[PDB]
């Protein structure tokens, strides 16, 4: 019978949902420039701290002199206590720890959606682009804590980020458990800088630094999820990134703050498209298929693609509190919204209904076309 088709509603890069979600080249370039600013400052902070250790290798300087040298570097932007601690850690280094520090140069690699290429323009006031650029410290393998030190490394990355925040109006710093964060409200953007220890020259030795707790390090390699997703796009096809964007857009529209993680949605969606027949020639039908199957994916718990990670991306239903129940409720409603939109009385009502899933972003009802199904 007659149905409304939404393939252009979703895919049109002029003014369909893809057109509303994909960053402009200027926006992408701005994020890349922000990342470069952070990377440069981090390299420079480490060179400064290393210059001091070089001085101490040459002559066993007093603590007071080491301190005064620390105070002329970007580390001056840390609190008095923290500056003292850097100075102390440099002062207390033995020959072997100091040598390895002198050979340490931070490396970089971007993770998250900027790297998955599924970063959406933010929807609701207050929502920001979640950007991640890890700092990697090549060091010998260690059992519980390396030479150089967990404390010194975090202090120097904090020094890099805090020195940028001091130099730029509209930038704020936040300490998170897994990263330092720079927030730039005015640009609807925050950039997260997790720090990793990695071997010197295969995921068993990539260690994420944790800011507080009974563990300073946890084995977590962002490349595992990155490779899994790139492999899934090749396996499933070009439409995978598109439907993941649409599910993330749904989430941004249903919750101002909160909702399921982007990775939980991506993992579930990959499982569905790997196992259920669908048709990239009609992404309206494909989204209906995904929507029909997401509730059962989420109710049983969404497993991480990284098998070494035993914490689910979303908990199974016997572990649900009010927030997970709220997510289940909105997941259950989504295929109903999409079905109702398909059988609406008019184009304008079709648009109104499907925009109750993705928000009022697409306004062009000409993208919706009368079809048979």
From Swiss-Prot:
The keyword Nucleotidyltransferase applies. Changing residue 39 to A: Abolishes enzyme activity. Changing residue 218 to R: No effect on enzyme activity. InterPro entries: DncV-like_NTFase (IPR048445), DncV_C (IPR048446), GAMP_synthase (IPR047805). GO terms for biological process: cyclic nucleotide biosynthetic process; defense response to virus; negative regulation of chemotaxis. Residues 300-319 are annotated as: Disordered. GO terms for molecular function: 3',3'-cyclic GMP-AMP synthase activity; ATP binding; diguanylate cyclase activity; GTP binding; metal ion binding. The keyword Magnesium applies. Induction: Expression is repressed by the transcriptional regulator VspR. Part of a CBASS operon consisting of capV-dncV-cap2-cap3. Its EC number is 2.7.7.-. It comes from the Bacteria. Overproduction of the cGAMP synthase DncV leads to an increase in intracellular cGAMP, and induces the formation of cells more translucent than normal with a defect in cell membrane integrity, planktonic growth arrest and a small colony phenotype in El Tor V.cholerae. This is Cyclic GMP-AMP synthase. It comes from Vibrio cholerae serotype O1 (strain ATCC 39315 / El Tor Inaba N16961). The lineage of its organism: Bacteria, Pseudomonadati, Pseudomonadota, Gammaproteobacteria, Vibrionales.
């Amino acid at each position: 019978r007659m149905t409304w088709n939404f393939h252009q509603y979703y895919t049109n890069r002029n003014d369909g949902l893809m057109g509303k979600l994909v960053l402009t080249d200027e926006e992408k370039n701005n994020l890349k420039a922000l990342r470069k600013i952070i990377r440069l400052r981090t390299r420079d902070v480490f060179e400064e701290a290393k210059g001091i250790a070089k001085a101490v290798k040459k002559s066993a300087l007093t603590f007071e002199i080491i301190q005064e040298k620390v105070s002329t570097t970007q580390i001056k932007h840390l609190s008095d206590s923290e500056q003292r601690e850097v100075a102390k850690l440099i002062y207390e280094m033995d020959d072997d720890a100091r040598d390895e520090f002198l050979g340490l140069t931070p490396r970089f690699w971007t993770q998250g959606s900027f790297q998955y290429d599924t970063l959406n323009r933010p929807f609701q006031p207050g929502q920001e682009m979640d950007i991640d650029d890890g700092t990697y410290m090549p060091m010998p393998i260690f059992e519980s804590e390396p030479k150089i030190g967990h404390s010194l490394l975090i202090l120097l990355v904090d020094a890099s980020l805090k020195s940028l925040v001091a130099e730029n109006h509209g930038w704020k710093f936040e300490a998170k458990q897994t990263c330092g964060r720079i927030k730039i409200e005015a640009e609807k953007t925050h950039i997260d800088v997790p720090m990793y220890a990695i071997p010197k020259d295969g995921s068993e030795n990539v260690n994420l630094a944790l800011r507080e707790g009974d563990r300073k390090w946890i084995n977590s390699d962002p490349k595992i999820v990155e490779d899994w997703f790139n492999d899934s796009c090749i396996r499933i096809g070009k439409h995978l990134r598109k439907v993941c964007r649409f599910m993330k857009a749904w989430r941004d529209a249903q919750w101002d703050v909160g909702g399921p993680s982007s990775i939980s949605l991506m993992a579930a969606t990959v499982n569905i498209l790997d196992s259920v027949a669908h048709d990239a020639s009609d992404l309206g039908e494909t989204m209906k298929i995904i929507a029909k199957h997401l509730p059962s994916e989420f109710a049983r718990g969404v497993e991480s693609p990284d098998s070494t990670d035993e914490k689910p991306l979303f908990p199974p239903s016997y572990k649900h509190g009010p927030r997970e129940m709220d997510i289940m409720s909105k997941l259950e409603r989504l295929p109903e919204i999409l079905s109702s939109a398909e059988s609406a009385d008019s184009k304008s009502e079709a648009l109104k209904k499907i925009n109750m899933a993705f928000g009022n972003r697409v306004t062009n009802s000409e993208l919706i076309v009368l079809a048979k199904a």
